[PDB]
Ligand binder design. Structure first.
Ligand SMILES: [Mg+2]
Ligand SMILES: [Mg+2]
Ligand SMILES: [Mg+2]
Ligand SMILES: [Mg+2]
Ligand SMILES: [Mg+2]
Ligand SMILES: [Mg+2]
Ligand SMILES: [Mg+2]
Ligand SMILES: [Mg+2]
Ligand SMILES: [Mg+2]
Ligand SMILES: [Mg+2]
Ligand SMILES: [Mg+2]
Ligand SMILES: [Mg+2]
Ligand SMILES: [Mg+2]
Ligand SMILES: [Mg+2]
Ligand SMILES: [Mg+2]
Ligand SMILES: [Mg+2]
Ligand SMILES: [Mg+2]
Ligand SMILES: [Mg+2]
Ligand SMILES: [Mg+2]
Ligand SMILES: [Mg+2]
Ligand SMILES: [Mg+2]
Ligand SMILES: [Mg+2]
Ligand SMILES: [Mg+2]
Ligand SMILES: [Mg+2]
Ligand SMILES: [Mg+2]
Ligand SMILES: [Mg+2]
Ligand SMILES: [Mg+2]
Ligand SMILES: [Mg+2]
Ligand SMILES: [Mg+2]
Ligand SMILES: [Mg+2]
Ligand SMILES: [Mg+2]
Ligand SMILES: [Mg+2]
Ligand SMILES: [Mg+2]
Ligand SMILES: [Mg+2]
Ligand SMILES: [Mg+2]
Ligand SMILES: [Mg+2]
Ligand SMILES: [Mg+2]
Ligand SMILES: [Mg+2]
Ligand SMILES: [Mg+2]
Ligand SMILES: [Mg+2]
Ligand SMILES: [Mg+2]
Ligand SMILES: [Mg+2]
Ligand SMILES: [Mg+2]
Ligand SMILES: [Mg+2]
Ligand SMILES: [Mg+2]
Ligand SMILES: [Mg+2]
Ligand SMILES: [Mg+2]
Ligand SMILES: [Mg+2]
Ligand SMILES: [Mg+2]
Ligand SMILES: [Mg+2]
Ligand SMILES: [Mg+2]
Ligand SMILES: [Mg+2]
Ligand SMILES: [Mg+2]
Ligand SMILES: [Mg+2]
Ligand SMILES: [Mg+2]
Ligand SMILES: [Mg+2]
Ligand SMILES: [Mg+2]
Ligand SMILES: [Mg+2]
Ligand SMILES: [Mg+2]
Ligand SMILES: [Mg+2]
Ligand SMILES: [Mg+2]
Ligand SMILES: [Mg+2]
Ligand SMILES: [Mg+2]
Ligand SMILES: [Mg+2]
Ligand SMILES: [Mg+2]
Ligand SMILES: [Mg+2]
Ligand SMILES: [Mg+2]
Ligand SMILES: [Mg+2]
Ligand SMILES: [Mg+2]
Ligand SMILES: [Mg+2]
Ligand SMILES: [Mg+2]
Ligand SMILES: [Mg+2]
Ligand SMILES: [Mg+2]
Ligand SMILES: [Mg+2]
Ligand SMILES: [Mg+2]
Ligand SMILES: [Mg+2]
Ligand SMILES: [Mg+2]
Ligand SMILES: [Mg+2]
Ligand SMILES: [Mg+2]
Ligand SMILES: [Mg+2]
Ligand SMILES: [Mg+2]
Ligand SMILES: [Mg+2]
Ligand SMILES: [Mg+2]
Ligand SMILES: [Mg+2]
Ligand SMILES: [Mg+2]
Ligand SMILES: [Mg+2]
Ligand SMILES: [Mg+2]
Ligand SMILES: [Mg+2]
Ligand SMILES: [Mg+2]
Ligand SMILES: [Mg+2]
Ligand SMILES: [Mg+2]
Ligand SMILES: [Mg+2]
Ligand SMILES: [Mg+2]
Ligand SMILES: [Mg+2]
Ligand SMILES: [Mg+2]
Ligand SMILES: [Mg+2]
Ligand SMILES: [Mg+2]
Ligand SMILES: [Mg+2]
Ligand SMILES: [Mg+2]
Ligand SMILES: [Mg+2]
Lengths: 197, 106, 157, 127, 111, 48
RNA sequence: UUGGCGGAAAGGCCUUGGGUGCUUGCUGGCGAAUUGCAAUGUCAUUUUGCGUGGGGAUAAAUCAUUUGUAUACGACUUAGA
RNA sequence: GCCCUGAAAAUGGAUGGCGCUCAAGCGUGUUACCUAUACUCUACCGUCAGGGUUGAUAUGAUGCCCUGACGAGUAGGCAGGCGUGGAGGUCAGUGACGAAGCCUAGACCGUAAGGUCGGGUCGAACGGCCUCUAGUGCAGAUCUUGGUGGUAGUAGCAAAUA
RNA sequence: GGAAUACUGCCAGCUGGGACUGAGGACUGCGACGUAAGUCAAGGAUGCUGGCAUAAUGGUUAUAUGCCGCCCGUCUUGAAA
RNA sequence: GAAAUUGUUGAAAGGGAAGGGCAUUUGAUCAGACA
């Protein structure tokens, strides 16, 4: 029902999240994806490390510039797993890729909107308890992404600013719940309780 | 009131198609809020109109409307087929199409 | 001659129509249409207006009368399929509509004085029934509109 | 006003173009049957051009009929037009391309008095 | 092929709805009862129920009643074929073979 | 990295003014003339 | 209009003060009609152009000439009121 | 049973790709659902077969009309038609107030071969039908003849002292 | 000891919503509903009503979009080669 | 005074070919039917 859906990346998978976004991008919905450094991959860390160096050695022999580009950014690795799920070579696929904005961390334009999760894409509702996981931010640093420290510094900065907003919000909803103390004993609340409200 | 919507908003998904063979005469309209084919039985026979715009004054109105209706259900997730008078131009995939409530049953 | 004339020259007389077997049967309306039902209009100039039902006409149309004081809907025909019927009943026992028919709404500018005086007679015995129950005059003046999160296959109307 | 007739369906409203007609200027646009051994038209693969055959025929009720409802007939002079006196609602007059301007004013003045429709009244107007 | 044991209901659903009789060279529907009388009146059959009586109760003149009926042009079943693999035997979970009384569910779906 | 503020000096020499132009003989030598209006005030826009 | 905060693409958020429109929190008066039994019945949004009214600003680049730290040609790199 | 070792090849790579790991994997069931020029029904064209119909005033009895089944296809066979050169007959055909030809993202008819019309150019013979005749229908035969492009304003216009 | 229900099967039981189709063109045939005059869903559509009468539907053509489509001819068991 | 080829003007499109088929939009253009 929202015009722009903001999906948090923390605690989600890759292939089960890119599939439930690339279908929604072909439906006319705009989806932005933030905090991609906390995205998780099933399996242990060294296996998902071997499945990237097996792809890192895949390039065009006579000119490595024209070969497959090997991106280190976790926001772009997730975009690589999503552009394979969209027919990007057609004009319809080029319009679905303009509907997305995948970021690293939570940007100051997209920090005051409510983020959602996809319950068929969490790392905990799909995996068995006792299986090994792989953080995409820890994977990208080990293969050549240089921007883990500049994000976690700024990620710890917004959490100080988001805790001051929530401490104001929980002190305000308490005043709303205390203003509903006079809503009792009235004849209007005894008529809304009989209509399901 | 702030709202004046007397229709149900919906998205055009695709045509009726195979892996490669497509049928442009029958489209696929997703209804928001419908996830079962038992809930898609109410929208059977409702007139679907696609409101778009243009630049030529043909009636003193840039807005041009193509018409259609509901034939049957599709799949299990609540996808609703729709045949149109003139077919949708295949660029309007994922475009908001209007689904009215008339002819009503209630 | 640039073209040779034909040989058969088929007949110019048109064939008469065969005797079709199709009779004029009375319409069986659905069970949600009783006289005195608040009707939600879907299309037309008065779309979304909650309005009072009186009587089924002859040419498959329904009487939409008023109240013209409440929401400004005059004596007007409507189609049966273009109307969502609710489950709220109002009295119709004091309504003097007997003469309103197909010839009354037939086309022949200016509003006829017969259309003005017949509106106030019908709307006199209806508003006196509306004021008996609370919040029904406020219910008919307001228009209907689907909000966000509404599912019309789930609604009861 | 012609005779009553049902809705005319042509079943193929498109002119048949030959395979490789717009690629080579030596090949005309007239449909000629491709009789090769490796043709993608004779074997009827998907996505290629369609072949004209007997299934594309029009209804005999709606055959040789203009969208006005009448049939065409080439008219050279007045004597070739007076035969269509009792058949104004079925056939329509058509003045030939090699008719002079002194005779087109005679034919149109005769078919107007007989009720015979002329399909080309705008031919050679001195304006 | 797949053959079965039909009941009286599924035979009745075929003679009335898909019932076609072959007169001299033409596939003729059984719309009128005097048509059957004009062809099988020598054997005593003069109604469409006299054809059905020869089917379920196989009398001495079953061959002339069976040769008169055109082969029933059945459609695809409405609720599908059931099992996804057709070309195995019905005992192994397929379609063909000597299916029993369950044919009565399958004929009405195809009709 | 991203540059967001570059603060220049007030009275620059004619050497880097010649660097910023390709034709010093046709130019009106009007580089950093409106930038010198920033140093003409008290200095609220300078220390900002 | 006052006071701050926000630089990860901040371009937004919060707050003081007066002025003004509306208030369906409750109770009235009047108007709607004929778009004639439905026809999205047009109410958003993007860029540009030509006219009015008001404030503000008053330059460069290339060619040619010239230098060789440059040079196949272009480029690059210098100089000249 | 599954998994592991056994298990080493050369451009970068292939469960088709993305990717998945209480799997969208493997094994086994249950229903729901997606779609072929296939099936069932209906319209229309055509073919074949079985039939109805010379009675007069008003015209194809190689006709009209009804009913049923069927329709793929190279080599090849047969039938119905289209177009061109020329000849007999005929419409007392068309035309110097404009014939033939040519041009035409203008219109119409026929399933098609093609026919017709409007506009522009043009300057003089030409067409419909019933028949007869034939050095009569072209995309490619390293086809012939004639003309013109890409390459391309490129290779190059540098021995013999100026 | 007495019932209910599940499963399977039957109804020439009733009934709601949706889609496609309207081919035929005087009557004839076969049946139904009635004491009868007659009527009917009975060998294939009519009845009523509205808008427009114009490029609006539609035709041609250009372009865009979804999907499909590897240059023919020939020799060949096999040609996009 | 046709075609190949080519000039100017006008219209349209162009992310490593072009061209085609089915369907529709938009743009250009056009017949017929109406009294
Ligand atoms: Mg889309
Ligand atoms: Mg969209
Ligand atoms: Mg490459
Ligand atoms: Mg990919
Ligand atoms: Mg893909
Ligand atoms: Mg953004
Ligand atoms: Mg889990
Ligand atoms: Mg489908
Ligand atoms: Mg269509
Ligand atoms: Mg599209
Ligand atoms: Mg009758
Ligand atoms: Mg009824
Ligand atoms: Mg009913
Ligand atoms: Mg009011
Ligand atoms: Mg055609
Ligand atoms: Mg043409
Ligand atoms: Mg050929
Ligand atoms: Mg072959
Ligand atoms: Mg081929
Ligand atoms: Mg003449
Ligand atoms: Mg002419
Ligand atoms: Mg001409
Ligand atoms: Mg025989
Ligand atoms: Mg079912
Ligand atoms: Mg189904
Ligand atoms: Mg099945
Ligand atoms: Mg098999
Ligand atoms: Mg069936
Ligand atoms: Mg700045
Ligand atoms: Mg210079
Ligand atoms: Mg931004
Ligand atoms: Mg910032
Ligand atoms: Mg900034
Ligand atoms: Mg105020
Ligand atoms: Mg107000
Ligand atoms: Mg309000
Ligand atoms: Mg408006
Ligand atoms: Mg000077
Ligand atoms: Mg290689
Ligand atoms: Mg690869
Ligand atoms: Mg493998
Ligand atoms: Mg998987
Ligand atoms: Mg798969
Ligand atoms: Mg399984
Ligand atoms: Mg089931
Ligand atoms: Mg299910
Ligand atoms: Mg005969
Ligand atoms: Mg054949
Ligand atoms: Mg033929
Ligand atoms: Mg010939
Ligand atoms: Mg000849
Ligand atoms: Mg002659
Ligand atoms: Mg001429
Ligand atoms: Mg010529
Ligand atoms: Mg021309
Ligand atoms: Mg043209
Ligand atoms: Mg041309
Ligand atoms: Mg024509
Ligand atoms: Mg014409
Ligand atoms: Mg001319
Ligand atoms: Mg001469
Ligand atoms: Mg002459
Ligand atoms: Mg001959
Ligand atoms: Mg020869
Ligand atoms: Mg040829
Ligand atoms: Mg050839
Ligand atoms: Mg040639
Ligand atoms: Mg050649
Ligand atoms: Mg040649
Ligand atoms: Mg040559
Ligand atoms: Mg050349
Ligand atoms: Mg030169
Ligand atoms: Mg040179
Ligand atoms: Mg040399
Ligand atoms: Mg020399
Ligand atoms: Mg010398
Ligand atoms: Mg010397
Ligand atoms: Mg039953
Ligand atoms: Mg008819
Ligand atoms: Mg009786
Ligand atoms: Mg009847
Ligand atoms: Mg018009
Ligand atoms: Mg007009
Ligand atoms: Mg229209
Ligand atoms: Mg159109
Ligand atoms: Mg095109
Ligand atoms: Mg697509
Ligand atoms: Mg392809
Ligand atoms: Mg090619
Ligand atoms: Mg070819
Ligand atoms: Mg070989
Ligand atoms: Mg062979
Ligand atoms: Mg091979
Ligand atoms: Mg070949
Ligand atoms: Mg000349
Ligand atoms: Mg020019
Ligand atoms: Mg163009
Ligand atoms: Mg390129
Ligand atoms: Mg017209
Ligand atoms: Mg008239």
């Amino acid at each position: 029902v929202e015009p722009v859906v903001v999906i948090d990346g923390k605690g989600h998978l890759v292939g089960r999240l890119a599939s439930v976004v690339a279908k929604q991008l072909l439906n006319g919905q705009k989806i932005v994806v933030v905090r991609a450094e906390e995205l998780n991959i099933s399996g242990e860390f060294f296996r998902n490390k071997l499945k990237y160096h097996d792809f890192l050695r895949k390039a065009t022999a006579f000119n490595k510039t024209r070969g497959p580009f090997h991106f280190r950014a976790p926001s772009r690795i997730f975009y690589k797993a999503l552009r394979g799920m969209v027919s990007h070579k057609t004009a319809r696929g080029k319009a679905a890729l303009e509907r997305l904005k995948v970021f690293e961390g939570i940007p100051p334009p997209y920090d005051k909107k409510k983020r959602v999760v996809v319950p068929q894409a969490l790392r905990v509702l799909r995996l068995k308890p006792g299986r090994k996981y792989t953080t995409l931010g820890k994977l990208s640093t080990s293969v050549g992404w240089k921007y883990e420290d500049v994000v976690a510094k700024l990620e710890a900065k917004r959490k100080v600013s988001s805790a001051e907003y929530y401490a104001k919000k929980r002190a305000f909803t308490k005043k709303v719940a205390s203003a509903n103390a006079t809503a009792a004993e009235s004849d209007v609340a005894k008529q809304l309780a009989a209509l399901g409200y | 009131a702030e709202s004046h919507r007397l229709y149900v908003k919906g998205k055009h998904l695709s045509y009726q198609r195979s892996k490669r063979v497509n049928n442009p005469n029958v489209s696929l309209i997703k209804i928001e809020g419908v996830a079962t084919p038992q809930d898609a039985q109410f929208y059977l026979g409702k007139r679907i109109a696609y409101v778009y715009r243009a630049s030529k004054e043909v009636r003193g109105s840039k807005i041009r409307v193509m018409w259609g209706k509901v034939t049957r259900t599709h799949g299990n997730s609540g996808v609703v087929r729709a045949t149109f008078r003139n077919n949708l131009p295949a660029k309007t995939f994922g475009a908001s199409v209007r689904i009215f409530l008339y002819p009503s049953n209630i | 001659s640039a073209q040779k004339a034909p040989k058969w020259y088929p007949s110019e007389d048109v064939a008469a129509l065969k005797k079709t077997r199709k009779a004029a049967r009375p319409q069986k309306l659905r069970a949600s249409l009783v006289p005195g039902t608040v009707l939600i209009l879907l299309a037309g100039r008065f779309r979304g207006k909650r309005v009072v039902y009186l009587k089924h006409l002859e040419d498959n149309t329904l009487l939409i009368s008023g109240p013209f004081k409440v929401n400004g809907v005059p004596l007007r025909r409507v189609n049966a399929r273009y109307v969502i019927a609710t489950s709220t009943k109002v009295s119709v026992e004091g309504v003097n509509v007997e003469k309103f028919n197909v010839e009354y709404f037939a086309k022949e500018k200016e509003i006829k004085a017969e259309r003005v005086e017949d509106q106030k007679v019908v709307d006199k015995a209806l508003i006196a029934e509306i004021k008996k129950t609370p919040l029904l005059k406020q219910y008919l003046s307001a228009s209907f509109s689907l909000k966000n999160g509404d599912k019309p296959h789930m609604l009861k109307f | 006003a012609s005779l009553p007739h049902p809705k005319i369906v042509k079943k193929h409203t498109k002119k048949f173009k030959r395979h490789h007609s717009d690629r080579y200027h030596r090949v005309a646009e007239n449909w000629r049957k491709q009789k090769g051994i490796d043709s993608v038209v004779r074997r009827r693969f998907r996505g290629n051009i369609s072949q004209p055959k007997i299934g594309y025929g029009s209804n005999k009720k709606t055959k040789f009929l203009s969208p006005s409802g009448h049939k065409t007939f080439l008219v050279a002079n007045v004597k070739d037009l007076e035969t269509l006196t009792m058949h104004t609602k079925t056939y329509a007059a058509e003045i030939a391309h090699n008719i002079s301007a002194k005779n087109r004013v005679v034919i149109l003045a005769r078919a107007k008095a007989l009720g015979i429709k002329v399909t080309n009244p705008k031919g050679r107007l001195a304006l | 092929v797949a053959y079965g044991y039909p009941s009286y209901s599924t035979i009745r659903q075929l003679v009335y709805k898909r019932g076609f009789g072959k007169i001299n060279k033409q596939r003729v529907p059984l719309s009128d009862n005097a048509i059957i009388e004009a062809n099988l009146g020598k054997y005593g059959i003069l109604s469409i129920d006299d054809l059905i009586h020869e089917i379920i109760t196989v009398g001495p003149h079953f061959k002339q009643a069976n040769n008169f009926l055109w082969p029933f042009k059945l459609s695809n079943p409405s609720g599908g074929w059931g099992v996804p693999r057709k070309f195995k035997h019905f005992i192994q979970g397929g379609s063909f073979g000597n299916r029993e009384e369950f044919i009565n569910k399958l004929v009405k779906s195809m009709n | 990295l991203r540059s967001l503020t570059t603060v220049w000096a007030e009275h620059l020499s004619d050497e880097v003014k010649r660097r910023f132009y390709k034709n010093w003989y046709k130019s009106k030598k009007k580089a950093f003339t409106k930038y010198s209006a920033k140093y003409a005030q008290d200095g609220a826009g300078i220390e900002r």
